[PDB]
Each structure stands twice: as structure tokens, then as C-alpha cells.
Design a protein around this ligand. Structure first.
Ligand code: NAP
Ligand code: FOL
Ligand code: MN
Ligand code: MN
Ligand code: MN
Length: 159
């Protein structure tokens, strides 16, 4: 099974200048809980944005060019990325925009955080078709002293 996990600001913005400008510790904790002990697939730009391997997960990086760090696994196509995960119950695709576009048609589950924040971005989550997805979990949180925007955790499953 392939799942996508992402945090979306207003208008599906996910990034600006190869960074995420907000800071929502509760959402990073949600990301860790839902990805730990699973393989994670990311594109090369997201690898450079994170800046280090994510511990406790097999890190698989998509790039057309040879890898430059043997602490992670480098692959050259979608099918090779999936194969490099082995026989696991759930593969987590962690972006960025181009990678989400390619894996969305193959995904059965979306883990989405909707952040009530406006930022001027250059990368968006794919327009997906709402009729194709059933919301199976949603949990709203008001802003607090640690999390400066309200946010909504949602899990959607392909109908
Ligand atoms: N808010 C969130 O949830 C979230 C999550 C992840 C990322 N982000 C943000 O998203 C932005 C990065 O997204 P992005 O769309 O620019 O880049 P991306 O999807 O991270 O990376 C694209 C790169 O991945 C490689 N690639 C993708 N598909 C491939 C394929 N089929 N075969 C071979 N290589 C492939 C290519 O690398 P080569 O050029 O080396 O071939 C391509 O240039 C950043 O702003 C980051 O902060 C946000
Ligand atoms: N919901 C969601 N939020 C995100 O921030 C997110 N980020 C990415 C890509 N970028 C990043 C950037 C940093 C870390 C990170 O530092 N993760 C640590 C945090 C642990 C914690 O804060 O408790 C990790 O071990 O996962 C992960 C992904 C992909 N999907 C996401 N999905
Ligand atoms: Mn092929
Ligand atoms: Mn197999
Ligand atoms: Mn706000």
C-alpha cells in the first residue's frame, strides 16, 4: 500500500524556495508517529530541504543522477523506488510536489494536515479529485503557545 503524507497551507501551498516557512511542532510529531519504522520516499529537492537522514526509517531518494550519500538509498524511477521498499505493509511518500504528483494515482491513503496559514509559495500539493476520497479520521486543534496556527489532521482513504 502506498500512502502520501503532507502538510498544506491555504491554497494547497507546501513550500517556498525549497523550505517550509512555518513551524508547527505538533504536526512534526504527527509526521514522525505516522512514518517511524516505515520506508519513506522523497524527491531530491526534499532531501536537500530536510538536510539529513530521517532516523528510524529507510530513506529512499528519487533522482535521475547518481547518489551522493550512502546513508540513504538512491533510485532512478517510481517502480525502482517501490521495489527498494521491499515487502512492507505501508510505503510513505513524503514529497515534494513533483513526487506527490507521480504517486497520487497509486496511493490508497492520504495523511493531510490542513494549516490555517496564508504563505506565498512556489510548490503545491496536487489537485486531487475530492469525490475519490473518503475521510476516515479528522482532528481539529486550535493554535496554542507552541503552535501558532490552527490545524486539522485528516486521513483519507481512496473510495
Ligand atoms: N509541506 C509538506 O508536506 C512538504 C513535503 C515535502 C516537501 N515540501 C516542500 O516541497 C518543495 C520540494 O518539492 P519539489 O516539487 O520542488 O521537488 P521534489 O518533488 O522534492 O523533488 C523533485 C526531484 O526529484 C527527482 N525525481 C522526481 N521524480 C523522479 C523520477 N520519476 N525519476 C527520477 N527522479 C525523479 C528529480 O531529481 P533530479 O533533478 O536529481 O533528477 C526532481 O528534480 C520544498 O519547498 C519542500 O520544502 C513540503
Ligand atoms: N504533516 C506533515 N508535516 C510536515 O512537516 C511534513 N514534512 C515533510 C517534508 N519535510 C520534513 C522536514 C522536517 C522533518 C523532521 O524534522 N522530522 C522529524 C521531527 C520529529 C519531531 O518533531 O518530533 C522526524 O523525526 O520525523 C520531516 C519532514 C513531508 N511531509 C510532511 N507532513
Ligand atoms: Mn521503468
Ligand atoms: Mn514483493
Ligand atoms: Mn494563522
Amino acid at each position: 500500500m502506498i500512502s502520501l503524507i503532507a502538510a498544506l497551507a491555504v491554497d494547497r501551498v507546501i513550500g517556498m524556495e525549497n523550505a517550509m516557512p512555518w513551524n508547527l511542532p505538533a504536526d512534526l510529531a504527527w509526521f514522525k508517529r505516522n512514518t517511524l519504522n516505515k520506508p519513506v520516499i522523497m524527491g531530491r529537492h526534499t532531501w536537500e530541504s530536510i538536510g539529513r537522514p530521517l532516523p528510524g526509517r529507510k530513506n529512499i531518494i528519487l533522482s535521475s543522477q547518481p547518489g551522493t550519500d550512502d546513508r540513504v538509498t538512491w533510485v532512478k524511477s517510481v517502480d525502482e523506488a517501490i521495489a527498494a521498499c521491499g515487502d512492507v505493509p505501508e510505503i510513505m511518500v513524503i514529497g515534494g510536489g513533483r513526487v506527490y504528483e507521480q504517486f497520487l494515482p497509486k496511493a490508497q491513503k492520504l495523511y493531510l494536515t490542513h494549516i490555517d496559514a496564508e504563505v506565498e509559495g512556489d510548490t503545491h500539493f496536487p489537485d486531487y479529485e475530492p469525490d475519490d476520497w473518503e475521510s476516515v479520521f479528522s482532528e481539529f486543534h486550535d493554535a496554542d503557545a507552541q503552535n501558532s496556527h490552527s490545524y486539522c489532521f485528516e486521513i483519507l482513504e481512496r473510495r
